[PDB]
């Protein structure tokens, strides 16, 4: 828009509660896809998004898995003649560190809502909390 621009855009209401926040020591995001190029583009979007919000991120590529199975090519007899099929799974692991519970929800929503078709995520949150108050003091 050249001349016609919003004046005071409405922004969502964020209210700070009195409950303490979760503390995630680690947060591993394992994305899976049949296509390597899609993971490269998603890895760029996720690393850029993390860096813009202040999150610390690292990336590595777990070894790919190829599952192969054999089928019978003909409809009837001709046993020795087969057709083989495979499904390839490729992985990109985004290991985040030192996240509060509010930072991990907004980030995961933003990147989960933009998860391309054919891509599956496996978030593995690792929370750190104090000891139970009963355990803190031995009681007989």
């Amino acid at each position: 828009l050249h001349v016609d621009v919003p004046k005071d855009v409405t922004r969502p209401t964020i209210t700070t509660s009195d409950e303490p926040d979760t503390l995630y020591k680690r947060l591993s995001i394992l994305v899976k896809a049949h296509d390597r190029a899609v993971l490269d583009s998603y890895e760029y979007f996720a690393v850029l998004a993390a860096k813009e919000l202040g999150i610390s991120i690292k990336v590595h590529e777990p070894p790919r898995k190829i599952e192969r199975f054999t089928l019978l090519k003909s409809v009837h007899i001709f046993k020795k003649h087969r057709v083989q099929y495979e499904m390839r799974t490729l992985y990109r692991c985004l290991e985040l560190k030192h996240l509060t519970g509010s930072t991990a929800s907004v980030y995961l929503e933003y990147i989960q809502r933009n998860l391309p078709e054919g891509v599956a995520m496996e978030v593995t949150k690792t929370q750190i909390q104090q000891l139970p108050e009963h355990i803190k003091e031995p009681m007989w």
């Binding site: 509010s102 933009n114 054919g118 031995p138």
Partner: protein, 197 residues
Amino acid sequence: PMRRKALPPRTEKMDTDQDWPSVYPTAAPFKPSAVPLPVRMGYPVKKGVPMAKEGNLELLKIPNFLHLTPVAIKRHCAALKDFCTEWPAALDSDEKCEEHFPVEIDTADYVSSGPSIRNPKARAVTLRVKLSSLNLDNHAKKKLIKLVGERYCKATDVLTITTDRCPLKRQNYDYAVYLLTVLYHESWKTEDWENSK
């Protein structure tokens, strides 16, 4: 009854200094009439060039990132900063975290495509605590290590409690915390039969 005629593509009216994020606000399929790029895709025929964007099923088959561009992502995260909260500065190291927060609770989420959001693996929870963090007498630590069996790792001195028996994650989480309390309190208790070791 004259046939309807298609308008010229709107890319023709697009300036080179436009606000592209506005053109592709959200994930959409590739629209050759809205993408102002002479992109070509397709294995070319001999003495031929790759196919053009209009009527290109291959470009439609791609999960494009037009909505997610470096300009959009930076403008998006600028809005999303208000949501984030600051990590406590004091916990600048992993060792510092173990001192004040010795208990590590592992929970897993799964995101897939389908009508149902249910995955059986989301109920499982895993608690990890180091016995050094627990206040254990020489008697207690030996009793704690014998009861837990293979859950304790001598090399790392970490006790691992994995709870998936309960249906929900809030139940499995509360159960592992319960298992720790009983094991700790039981370890301190001394039974008469223990003197016969």
